[PDB]
Amino acid sequence: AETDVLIVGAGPAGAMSATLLASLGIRSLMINRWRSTSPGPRSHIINQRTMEILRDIGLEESAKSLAVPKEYMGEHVYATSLAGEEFGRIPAWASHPQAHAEHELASPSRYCDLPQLYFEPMVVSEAALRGADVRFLTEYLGHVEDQDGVTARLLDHVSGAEYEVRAKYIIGADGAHSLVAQNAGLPFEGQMGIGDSGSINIEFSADLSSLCEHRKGDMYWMFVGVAALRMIRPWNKWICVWGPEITKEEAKKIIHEIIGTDEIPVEVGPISTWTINQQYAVRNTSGRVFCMGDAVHRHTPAGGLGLNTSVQDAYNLAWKLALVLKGTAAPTLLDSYDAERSPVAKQIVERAFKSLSTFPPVFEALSLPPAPTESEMAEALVRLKDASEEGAKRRAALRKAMDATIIGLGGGHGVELNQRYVSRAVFPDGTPDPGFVRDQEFFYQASTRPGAHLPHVWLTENQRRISTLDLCGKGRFTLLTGLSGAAWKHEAEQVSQSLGIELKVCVIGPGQEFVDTYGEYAKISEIGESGALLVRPDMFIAFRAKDASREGLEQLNVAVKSILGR
Amino acid sequence: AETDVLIVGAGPAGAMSATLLASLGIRSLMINRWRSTSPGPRSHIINQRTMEILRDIGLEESAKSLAVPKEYMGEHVYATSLAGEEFGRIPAWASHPQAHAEHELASPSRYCDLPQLYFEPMVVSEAALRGADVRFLTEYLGHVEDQDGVTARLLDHVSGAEYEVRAKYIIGADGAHSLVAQNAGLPFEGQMGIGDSGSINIEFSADLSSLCEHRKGDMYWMFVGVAALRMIRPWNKWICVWGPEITKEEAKKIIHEIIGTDEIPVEVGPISTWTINQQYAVRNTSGRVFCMGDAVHRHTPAGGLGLNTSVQDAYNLAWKLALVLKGTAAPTLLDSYDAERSPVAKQIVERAFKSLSTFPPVFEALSLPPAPTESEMAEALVRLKDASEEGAKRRAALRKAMDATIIGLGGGHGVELNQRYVSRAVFPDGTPDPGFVRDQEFFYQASTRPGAHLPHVWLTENQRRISTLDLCGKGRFTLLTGLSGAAWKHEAEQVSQSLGIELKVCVIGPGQEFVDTYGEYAKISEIGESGALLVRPDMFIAFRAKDASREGLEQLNVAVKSILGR
């Protein structure tokens, strides 16, 4: 066997890598130990960035037609049981009109609810169609690196055979216990994730629309520990989660209690368990090996950043491998994979963990014990209806506590979108870092400075709305400018013919292909109309010029050659 | 390797077979020579029967959320070009209110538009998830049958290795040039399909909603030969088809002419060719080999019966192999596969071909030549606007001709649903064949007589509509009766414990789990309320009793033992 890139793993990171590589004409052989694509629903939250990437390749429309949309996952209800009395609700997943606006202004896509069970196979099938060899029931065993590529040993669970595959690079998208990471010797840190804890999940079917329809929500939390009624399909498919474990028909009981009532005909599906040693990789790259996904970041499910962050890891490295394999870019370009993705890995492991320190306070608000029994939790409901000044501080305390839990339920827009890149793959412009005017975890800050992702705004084509993001991507470099920067079209030519690289230029303005109809691009560019913003295949701005002056024009070439390593 | 059933092919028939077998707990290893699932859109029409089967397994909702629905494929427009003048339209795919009612009354599902490109992978991924081993890039080379199973030789296009797989049965779902059919020696007939002719298909993208939206249609025919603008995704994705061929950028020209105007920005995709030696197999079964799909029926694309008929071939044989492999049924049960599916194979090859003799008359109506040039076809448009009595006969002639083309565009409801089974797997009741009151190709006739598929009617559960079909299926035998046939619950028990077979009984009536709310079941059963209708896992009624009399009750056992071959 001989492939350009061996992809170990077919989950979110692997499938995406194979689809993008194929889309770029690079031969890749993605493997996966199991029969199917994952069985449980696992991850479910799809953030804007993941959507954008789905939109770039043409998989958004299908994605949206298998997901629950944003309007059905805004009611986060804290209660005793589903059929019980509530404590309160929070506007989850940017439901609050303010949060919704900030959401809508940051990108043309929007939160949706798509379980991994359906997302996986959509991407695996597309990778194959796009020309990426796929092969399940084949496990990676190890590899040996050498100066011209790698050879790896594969076990085939169908024939029982064993074989080698020669590849130029390997992508370690093999999960939480990456054998690829262990072989490459990648250092891991921040294991302080407390005491290694797991979760137990149970699937079951019931028709609980009568207790959902009027208050449509992605999840219904129960205080019972902090159990959780997560919707899989509205409102007939479910799952309970709570905090390596055996259970039986008794689970049906647990649920009947989690539903409060035992009258909706329930059908108990599979029962899994999930453990996690919270850690990141300090480095994601060793020689010709690159890891990504849970293979570089392992953490809690708070904020659902794991599947999203993993697809973004694949987006950042695909075009890069493709440019290097085609000889248009020097192998150095690959060094920025670690530079740009590694800080994202550590950032999310810590944030996902920090969010776990927001729930506990809801208990302390009900002046309760973590191991509340019944009377205790029934006496809390009483103390809460108290008509005294001390009942007010109390109710106020509980509202405060619950509202503090939003950062882990749709409130961390900054965390999802505020990616700042520093590396050879980004050509600095000379300006200083502007900062964040407001909290960088909670609110997103749009920025055209090199290192940041393009900012969304709407534009028009045939008088129909198109987003700045639609103009770019496509496995190519993008240059955006206006009418007065006409000179950018030629520069770009001279710098593309000479560098053997594709470089699409768009001159936005009146009577042009794309038009600044609402004047919003002029508003969000942070530069004259004659300036230019170079956009990488992954949507990040690496180069920014303030005008079309000879000294601004001459710099393009220096930036591209620099970004490519030549 | 060792599997219970080797499935050669992963298209519609193979994927479905693997999903159903898995669903029945039978170990199956489905293979496929290619990388992906098919690339072109190929088949696109999904008939009611295919839907029903999707609904039984739980894949209807997903299917419906990737398809164009019935309301967008009712306007069949005959024109010069898309942007030209029309000759006329026909109500395709049961759009006509009368046809729509007959459609809606025959089943709880409805025509939809889902290309094979999306349908394939939905079913392949589900088969894997359900526990069916899948493996592409593996080709079948041949096999040797022996009295206890078969051994087949496989070529692996990934490792280059060659290996054997031992299986009890093989399912030849390998297409139009089935190597499995040739090895099993299956006789083929009715090659008279005239002179072997092909079609050329071309994909392209344009935004032609401005010339579709007001007249939503599955296809736009152009008279140019009989070209055809088929929609893939409304209304940006397309394909032209017309009557082994090379073409280039010039195709873009062909289309610009097929669109009439050259102003919509067009993007030329792939260009394939499709050939077909019209033939059926006289027998579909040899020893331990069973063929299905195009491997048993090859024909034109008129009436889109091929993909539907192929899924139905898999539905008919899955439960059967499962009962035999579990030792609950004698190997003889498998003999009815040929008895019941074989006549369907010949019926559709001939019908698909006959439909090709309905188009030609539209020309003779315009008093034209098959090879019309331009002036000729422009002079036809003139002769058509003539204000004479001879212009009237003419316009009337053309309307007649076009309306005759409906049998191949949604008019053959009988053909899609009028399956009559005769075999050991059906226990006759003693009544004679009732016939069809109206044309058996055009209109469907519901019939509770053994050998026919359950008739759809609505019933209620929790006051919510459920279709008689929903009560049955599930890889099990189903007995339907009413309040006065209470005795059927016990009989069924005695006959299920003793035969080691699952047999669900439903007593439909007032205050029961299912209720004849609209009295429609009482109306369509053709028997007393005390009677019973036994339904096979494939939705076909094999046994029918007129009442709960001791002589009617005692017969159940004799029928089940007979249907199973014991």
Ligand SMILES: Cc1cc2nc3c(=O)[nH]c(=O)nc-3n(C[C@H](O)[C@H](O)[C@H](O)COP(=O)(O)OP(=O)(O)OC[C@H]3O[C@@H](n4cnc5c(N)ncnc54)[C@H](O)[C@@H]3O)c2cc1C
């Ligand atoms: C049970 C469970 C429940 C979860 N629930 C949630 C949730 O509710 N919310 C949330 O945000 N996140 C959840 N996660 C985490 C989430 O699944 C990850 O963030 C996401 O799957 C990362 O994608 P990945 O492809 O990197 O991981 P994976 O998809 O696990 O990548 C590894 C894949 O490669 C294959 N593979 C592994 N080892 C080998 C080998 N040696 N050889 C060949 N192939 C191999 C495996 O088939 C595996 O599918 C859950 C994880 C698990 C396990």
Ligand SMILES: Cc1cc2nc3c(=O)[nH]c(=O)nc-3n(C[C@H](O)[C@H](O)[C@H](O)COP(=O)(O)OP(=O)(O)OC[C@H]3O[C@@H](n4cnc5c(N)ncnc54)[C@H](O)[C@@H]3O)c2cc1C
């Ligand atoms: C180009 C094209 C266009 C078409 N367009 C239409 C249309 O517009 N309308 C319509 O109604 N019908 C159309 N058809 C016919 C339609 O595709 C068939 O009715 C349908 O595909 C039947 O399903 P199947 O799985 O039996 O066929 P297939 O899916 O072809 O079954 C064979 C499959 O098994 C695999 N296989 C084959 N040989 C081997 C081997 N030796 N070893 C291992 N694996 C093997 C192949 O990968 C192949 O996918 C078209 C067919 C083609 C080829």
